[PDB]
Design a protein around this ligand. Structure first.
Ligand SMILES: OC[C@H]1O[C@@H]2O[C@H]3[C@H](O)[C@@H](O)[C@@H](O[C@H]4[C@H](O)[C@@H](O)[C@@H](O[C@H]5[C@H](O)[C@@H](O)[C@@H](O[C@H]6[C@H](O)[C@@H](O)[C@@H](O[C@H]7[C@H](O)[C@@H](O)[C@@H](O[C@H]8[C@H](O)[C@@H](O)[C@@H](O[C@H]9[C@H](O)[C@@H](O)[C@@H](O[C@H]1[C@H](O)[C@H]2O)O[C@@H]9CO)O[C@@H]8CO)O[C@@H]7CO)O[C@@H]6CO)O[C@@H]5CO)O[C@@H]4CO)O[C@@H]3CO
Ligand SMILES: OC[C@H]1O[C@@H]2O[C@H]3[C@H](O)[C@@H](O)[C@@H](O[C@H]4[C@H](O)[C@@H](O)[C@@H](O[C@H]5[C@H](O)[C@@H](O)[C@@H](O[C@H]6[C@H](O)[C@@H](O)[C@@H](O[C@H]7[C@H](O)[C@@H](O)[C@@H](O[C@H]8[C@H](O)[C@@H](O)[C@@H](O[C@H]9[C@H](O)[C@@H](O)[C@@H](O[C@H]1[C@H](O)[C@H]2O)O[C@@H]9CO)O[C@@H]8CO)O[C@@H]7CO)O[C@@H]6CO)O[C@@H]5CO)O[C@@H]4CO)O[C@@H]3CO
Ligand code: CA
Ligand code: CA
Ligand code: CA
Ligand code: CA
Lengths: 597, 597
């Protein structure tokens, strides 16, 4: 091997919250060397060696007096000497104070390979392990950053204010590289998507259109083709000494009074799959590496926040420190952890401010609301149940378990589950109820690309490829183009219109962002709730039955306070409320009313 | 009425914790009288007069200097004078400190009408509204206290240490009087069961056999034929002015940050059914009445605790005071609330010691563990699921939500749900798993009469009559008789023998009463857990599959610590533990090992 092959992070910033910076330097016999530097405000701590002669960790303390600039780090040993020009950048104005995504936002989720192919020429890149195959469900289809940039106006036009793409970091695998969840280089965009600079441009172009950029970060694991695997930095870098030992996924084991250490360790150290080596985050070098890398992306790419994969599969103590570090840099940031459980207590455990039985503490601002999504999908699909919506109501009543339920991400769907329209049984009227719910709950809504034109999938079991079909219009030659509206059916277009109507309306509804919620127990699969404050009331009523239903309004008087009627935002019709609310079969109304004193 | 028709409570005790005693006096124009008395230590408080001429509430303060004895309360008015000789009983030594049922106990549950007809002559009682009909599923079959007493040896012989009969208080209804849940006289045993004195004798006879007696109390409602209903003590004694307004059962509404007052009021004030007038517990006279009545039963009948029906259907503030009052009198008592929800947070809300988001405080020691019973019934029934036992494991992991999870009552079944054997799909092997689970969990186990001989029922929905078939041997002429063994199949006898073996064994296993629990995440519907302390380990392993399973024992070494083998208590077979645990199809083993160092 040659010179310095990797320097990570490759540059940094003056004026960060945490003064320490740990450089991970890789190259043949770099560990046999001694580093030296001279720059006011930067102090070189002095080596703690690792047995591997091919890695050197350099500990810097960057004082508040250190100014933007650059300086040489010089490595000397065995009659030779190596050099790296290290840059400390100036931070953009307002960087530390950046506002993360919140209740007023709506997030549009894409898989960058499956959204838009702006440049067919990067579909394959010389030297990489996988060839593109649009006809393979698990293959690379060729979506890229150029295609995403091309369609930012579309996403903004739909009413979305944040973009969350699944990971774009290099995944140089021989197969299943497209999904991004097995990083082979945490400091590089996969060249098939574009360059590091292209990703920065994506952020800047999104910001021009009023949209934030949320990065999808994996912390627990990497891909087996990561360059580390060819020469392990330390013998304990990867859990189980770099050998495949599978997790059995006992997620409660990390938060269970009756847990076996075997099960907790298996959850946090066990390999997700054979092709995903598990990072030993109990090694402080690994912890520092991940914390610094994610900060580096936030700072470099001007992100509004993060979505954190496989949340509890990382070491718990590491997550405590990681969340503390990120949030100390960016106190107004949001980060949404993916803790995939339908049990509210299991999700709620991880949110900042939670008083946990075991004293577990976290600075994680948000989690994905799998419990509530599961409840609504059940309600809308099990149409033979007398009162399926009761599950939604009862799940929501558990919100007190969360320190900040209003900061949780509620979603129509995502790349891991059945398509929203399919989960609703291809029932457009019931799908409308799901959409209304998503846009009116005291949550941060997230929507999955393609759902706005009722893309379908298999509903039973798990079928990842079926959830990730190419967006129509993302590829040259497509017969239908959802970006332009060309070739959409009337129902598809009606869906897209409704999404655009509701999401744009929602942006302008402070009562949804921070108003109160009062809901009523569902009765025979009818459900009424209100968002309210002194300025506005929004009354949602849904009739989840294939028959008309009539609801006496006396029941709702603490919210209605004698309102004789209101205008339904959906239909534009005036709806009577004096003595009863008459719902047509499978209907939902969104009645807008004056404030509640 | 004839002078004083009802005096309630009819007598009291010297030396109670709460000095106050409120007498509810009933009779024609008694409300027009004025009470007077002269007895050392007893003070008459100045009157508070309700507009109903047929009732008088008399407030006494019984100071600690009041001795046991009697004194006349004289009621003077309109030139007439009525007397009542009031008695203060001496309390039994150790009364206040009585030990309530706890984790070392096992509760046997009966319905008195359905267990044993010791006296056919009381099946009908002249004057009563219902005639017995043994062939009618919802009729009175004639079981009584004499029959229960006749068979205490049998219950004690099975290994049970507490008897819980469903209510024996008067239910003088035209139809469905048998079940006891619609009281028509809170101070009287239904004469078809026997007298008040017979109930005291049931308690004393049970005690002679090492068994406590747990009374089933209804607080929220009475029956429509209660004598109150003919002449309402106050206009607000019954919720909704004594007229039927149904509850819609929105149980979470009393513990939901988004609750409507309409829903929460409807839950606690709404009538359970038309035949069950709802008590207005916000009226302090109603509150005092119930508190005193239940204390009266505890003191009079020498009870070891209570089972409290329809728990959250009572007023929340009333419940705080009721539980406070009862626990003040009897600090070591146990009372188990029936809060029928399969959601851990909903049940846990009510247990003494819980820190609730809304500051709600309760003194209730115990609740019925519907969530865990539901989880195990799901695991045993969902035979098409690869790992249904995962529900049990995850539910258990939520025990940190309860202040005192070991004090919760775990049950094989009860009078409101499908028969335990039917719940296991009539699979003897799965039934054994449920039984072992019940007898080894950190819980107070409760068992439903008839389950020890594998009685069956319908499985779906609610079918009360199906769960409540006459105990075989309870009636003269029965051709299957569980008391003698006559007519039982080999399998039914084996069930009975196993109940006896495990219950009696449990009695002598402190490690089950107060030991730790460590469980392991179930894998492919195999599950291993341990009860352990310095003295003993008890390993439970179950294979919920119709194929053999081989579990490497490395996994369990934090509990096994190299144990080469053990003896299965159940089969009495030796079980290898050195390298692998071989489980036969549908097996459960229970292995005793010495305590860990
Ligand atoms: O970065 C890795 C991935 O992380 C992220 O998502 C993961 C979550 O963090 C993690 O918790 C977990 O979620 C599970 C959740 O916790 C569970 O409660 C449960 O929820 C329900 C589930 O959704 C239902 O489908 C069902 O589960 C059963 C299912 O019906 C049944 O078919 C079977 O599933 C087995 C598959 O059939 C089998 O093929 C294989 O799965 C493969 C998969 O086919 C393959 O494509 C590959 O997956 C890739 C994936 O495409 C990538 O995107 C990347 O995934 C990341 C996610 O995108 C993140 O968001 O990497 C993956 C790994 O390479 O590999 C899979 C693994 O072999 O095995 C399956 C079983 O082992 O059985 C299941 C039950 O076991 O019912 C559940 C109701 O309780 O399941 C959640 C997952 O669906 O997993 C997330 C990754 O999916
Ligand atoms: O003291 C009263 C009883 O209290 C104790 O148990 C009750 C629990 O505290 C309470 O939480 C709830 O528990 C669960 C319930 O058992 C489950 O069924 C289920 O309930 C939901 C159900 O799944 C839904 O379908 C719906 O139920 C409605 C139902 O669909 C609808 O038809 C109607 O119900 C009527 C019946 O269908 C009809 O037959 C008749 O009922 C008769 C009954 O057949 C007869 O035996 C007699 O019932 C007695 C009972 O036998 C007594 O033992 C006593 O019950 C107490 C329990 O034993 C306690 O342990 O009193 C009963 C009389 O009230 O008389 C009945 C009335 O004539 O009429 C029914 C009523 O119209 O309406 C229901 C309700 O809307 O919603 C259910 C709630 O969401 O899950 C519940 C908890 O989640 O009820 C327990 C009693 O079953
Ligand atoms: Ca491309
Ligand atoms: Ca891990
Ligand atoms: Ca009888
Ligand atoms: Ca009530």
């Amino acid at each position: 091997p040659t010179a310095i092959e990797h320097m990570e992070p490759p540059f940094w910033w003056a004026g960060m919250q945490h003064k320490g910076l740990q450089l991970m330097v890789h190259g043949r016999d770099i560990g046999r060397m001694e580093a030296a530097l001279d720059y006011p405000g930067v102090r070189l701590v002095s080596p703690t060696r690792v047995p591997n002669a091919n890695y050197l960790f350099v500990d810097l303390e960057i004082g508040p007096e250190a100014q933007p600039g650059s300086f040489d780090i010089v490595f000397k040993g065995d009659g030779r000497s190596e050099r790296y020009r290290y840059r400390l950048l100036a931070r953009e104005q307002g960087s530390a104070q950046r506002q993360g995504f919140g209740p007023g936002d709506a997030i549009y989720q894409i898989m960058p390979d499956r959204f838009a192919n702006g440049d067919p020429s990067n579909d394959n890149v010389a030297g990489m392990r996988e060839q593109a195959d649009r006809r393979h469900g698990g293959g690379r289809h060729g979506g890229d950053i150029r295609g995403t940039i091309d369609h930012l106006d579309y996403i903004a036009g739909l009413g979305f204010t944040q973009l969350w793409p699944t990971p774009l970091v290099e995944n140089d695998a021989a197969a299943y590289s497209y999904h991004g969840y097995a990083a082979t280089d945490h400091y590089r965009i996969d060249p098939r998507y574009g360059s590091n600079e292209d990703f920065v441009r994506l952020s800047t172009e999104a910001r021009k259109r009023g949209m934030g950029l949320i990065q999808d970060v994996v912390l627990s694991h990497i891909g087996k083709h990561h360059w580390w695997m060819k020469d392990l930095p330390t013998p304990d870098w990867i859990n189980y000494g770099g050998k495949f030992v599978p997790t059995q996924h006992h997620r409660v084991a990390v938060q269970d009074p009756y847990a076996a250490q075997a099960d907790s360790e298996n959850f946090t150290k066990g390999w997700f799959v054979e092709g995903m080596p598990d990072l030993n985050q109990t090694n402080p070098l690994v912890a520092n590496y991940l914390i610094q890398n994610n900060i580096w992306w936030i700072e470099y790419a001007g992100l509004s926040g993060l979505r954190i994969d496989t949340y509890g599969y990382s070491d718990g103590a590491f997550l405590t420190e990681y969340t503390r570090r990120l949030m100390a840099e960016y106190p107004r940031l949001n980060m949404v952890g993916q803790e995939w459980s339908t049990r509210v207590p299991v999700v709620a455990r991880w949110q900042r401010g939670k008083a946990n039985f075991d004293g577990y503490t976290s600075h994680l601002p948000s989690l994905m609301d799998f419990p509530l999504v599961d409840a609504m999908r059940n309600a809308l699909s099990k149409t033979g149940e007398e009162n399926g919506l009761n599950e939604v109501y009862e799940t929501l009543s558990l919100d007190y378990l969360y320190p900040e339920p209003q900061n949780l991400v509620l979603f129509g769907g995502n790349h891991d589950m059945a398509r929203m329209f399919s989960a609703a049984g291809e029932d457009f009227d019931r799908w409308r109820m799901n959409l209304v719910f998503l846009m009116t709950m005291p949550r941060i809504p997230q929507f999955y690309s393609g759902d706005e034109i009722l893309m379908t999938s298999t509903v039973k079991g798990r079928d990842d490829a079926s959830y990730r079909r190419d967006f129509p219009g993302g590829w040259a030659g497509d017969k239908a183009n959802a970006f332009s509206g060309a070739g959409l059916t009337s129902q598809q277009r009606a869906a897209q219109d409704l999404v655009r109507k509701l999401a744009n309306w929602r942006k302008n509804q402070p009562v949804i962002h921070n108003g109160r919620l009062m809901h009523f127990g569902p009765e025979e699969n009818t459900w009424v709730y209100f968002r309210y404050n002194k300025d506005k009331r929004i009354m949602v009523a849904m009739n989840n039955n294939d028959k008309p239903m009539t609801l006496p309004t006396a029941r709702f008087q603490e919210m209605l306070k004698g309102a004789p009627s209101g205008v339904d935002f959906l239909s534009g019709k005036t709806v009577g409320l004096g003595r009863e609310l008459r719902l047509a079969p499978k209907s939902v109304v969104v009645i807008e009313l004056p404030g509640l004193p």
